[PDB]
Design a protein around this motif. Sequence first.
Motif, mmCIF file in Angstrom:
data_model
loop_
_atom_site.group_PDB
_atom_site.id
_atom_site.type_symbol
_atom_site.label_atom_id
_atom_site.label_comp_id
_atom_site.label_asym_id
_atom_site.label_seq_id
_atom_site.Cartn_x
_atom_site.Cartn_y
_atom_site.Cartn_z
ATOM 1 N N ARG A 1 0.830 -1.208 0.000
ATOM 2 C CA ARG A 1 0.000 0.000 0.000
ATOM 3 C C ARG A 1 0.862 1.254 0.000
ATOM 4 N NH1 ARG A 1 -4.846 -0.581 -2.310
ATOM 5 N NH2 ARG A 1 -5.078 -2.867 -2.168
ATOM 6 N N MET B 1 1.121 2.375 -3.465
ATOM 7 C CA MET B 1 -0.111 3.013 -3.871
ATOM 8 C C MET B 1 -0.405 4.352 -3.211
ATOM 9 S SD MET B 1 -2.720 2.282 -6.034
ATOM 10 C CE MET B 1 -3.410 0.483 -5.931
ATOM 11 N N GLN C 1 -0.125 7.960 -5.679
ATOM 12 C CA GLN C 1 -1.400 8.624 -5.860
ATOM 13 C C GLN C 1 -1.299 10.005 -5.264
ATOM 14 O OE1 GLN C 1 -4.862 6.497 -4.552
ATOM 15 N NE2 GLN C 1 -5.140 5.559 -6.553
ATOM 16 N N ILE D 1 -0.252 9.328 -15.543
ATOM 17 C CA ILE D 1 -1.424 8.492 -15.407
ATOM 18 C C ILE D 1 -1.257 7.242 -16.244
ATOM 19 C CG2 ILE D 1 -3.789 8.189 -16.137
ATOM 20 C CD1 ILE D 1 -4.320 11.055 -15.378
ATOM 21 N N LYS E 1 -1.452 3.847 -13.936
ATOM 22 C CA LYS E 1 -2.772 3.222 -13.987
ATOM 23 C C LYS E 1 -2.734 1.683 -14.076
ATOM 24 C CE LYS E 1 -7.347 3.755 -16.092
ATOM 25 N NZ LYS E 1 -8.116 3.712 -17.365
ATOM 26 N N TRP F 1 -1.562 0.044 -10.990
ATOM 27 C CA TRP F 1 -2.692 0.185 -10.081
ATOM 28 C C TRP F 1 -3.759 -0.880 -10.301
ATOM 29 C CZ3 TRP F 1 -3.949 6.129 -9.874
ATOM 30 C CH2 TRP F 1 -2.803 6.809 -9.459
ATOM 31 N N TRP G 1 -4.916 -3.539 -7.642
ATOM 32 C CA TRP G 1 -6.266 -3.638 -7.090
ATOM 33 C C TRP G 1 -6.840 -4.999 -7.332
ATOM 34 C CZ3 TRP G 1 -7.533 1.239 -10.213
ATOM 35 C CH2 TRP G 1 -7.183 2.384 -9.488
ATOM 36 N N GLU H 1 -6.125 -7.785 -5.244
ATOM 37 C CA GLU H 1 -6.626 -7.472 -3.928
ATOM 38 C C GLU H 1 -8.053 -7.956 -3.751
ATOM 39 O OE1 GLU H 1 -4.942 -6.996 -1.777
ATOM 40 O OE2 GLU H 1 -6.458 -6.655 -0.199
ATOM 41 N N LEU H 2 -8.845 -7.800 -4.804
ATOM 42 C CA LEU H 2 -10.217 -8.279 -4.805
ATOM 43 C C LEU H 2 -10.218 -9.784 -4.940
ATOM 44 C CD1 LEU H 2 -12.043 -5.620 -6.924
ATOM 45 C CD2 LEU H 2 -10.779 -5.493 -4.778
ATOM 46 N N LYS I 1 -7.955 -11.691 -3.689
ATOM 47 C CA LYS I 1 -7.667 -12.242 -2.375
ATOM 48 C C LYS I 1 -8.960 -12.252 -1.558
ATOM 49 C CE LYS I 1 -4.612 -14.563 -0.397
ATOM 50 N NZ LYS I 1 -5.247 -15.165 0.800
ATOM 51 N N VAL I 2 -9.516 -11.073 -1.322
ATOM 52 C CA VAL I 2 -10.765 -10.912 -0.592
ATOM 53 C C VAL I 2 -11.880 -11.764 -1.163
ATOM 54 C CG1 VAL I 2 -12.644 -9.321 -0.123
ATOM 55 C CG2 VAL I 2 -10.298 -8.553 0.163
ATOM 56 N N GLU J 1 -11.011 -15.501 -0.107
ATOM 57 C CA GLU J 1 -11.201 -15.618 1.316
ATOM 58 C C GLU J 1 -12.682 -15.685 1.697
ATOM 59 O OE1 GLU J 1 -7.161 -13.288 2.587
ATOM 60 O OE2 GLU J 1 -9.155 -12.689 3.317
#
Lengths: 125, 125
Positions: free
Chosen positions: B2, B5, B9, B70, B74, B77, B81, B84-85, B87-88, B91
């Motif tokens: 993070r 990130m 940003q 950008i 991008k 990024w 992201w 990350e989704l 993973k979640v 889980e």
Amino acid sequence: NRMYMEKSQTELGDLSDTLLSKVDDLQDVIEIMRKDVAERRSQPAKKKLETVSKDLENAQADVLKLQEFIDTEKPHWKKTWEAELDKVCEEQQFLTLQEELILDLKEDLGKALETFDLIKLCCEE
Amino acid sequence: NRMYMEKSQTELGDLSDTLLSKVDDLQDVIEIMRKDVAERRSQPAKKKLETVSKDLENAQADVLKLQEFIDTEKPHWKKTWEAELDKVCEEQQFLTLQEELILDLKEDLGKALETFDLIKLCCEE
């Protein structure tokens, strides 16, 4: 934090497989008697009974506590997942504002040039 | 990470606040000229016609340069992201399987209880 999370998650799967076992076990030791009583007529010792009864009481409680873990960690997980889903959301909300902004610049910097040019044709003629 | 990130940003942000300050200044400047020219036909200093005309170019350079920032980050990024989704996301499907399991245990286990209780009653006799 998130370390705690992938810990509790692997454990759940542990308890749950420490049961899928105990239960698949009773499913046999009992289908075994079921066969012995339904045909053979050989009744199991009064031990075999008293012991496979404790065996089922164990299991039965082993569920009740598996069902605690879930009902207790589900909150924190559900929340932790939520926080994470939020950061990604705002981080992407940013890149969105930003992508718009660069357009309002390209816009504004234009109407500037357009106007700076008009002045120039005025400033000589 | 993070930190990657949160910083790249913060950077995009700084980069365009800067560009926005520049565009805003250009705008103000050019407006004043417009007033003179229009209202008084009082021409602007022939030097400013040279300083402004350059600054619209630094600014147009600065857009290009921003826009590149950008276009290059991008992708990192997105990849960041989506990692990350996923993973979640996983889980969560896991959690969901454990829920459907303690259901088939409670079930599998109750049908043995139902059946042992029937045997234990064929020996009571």
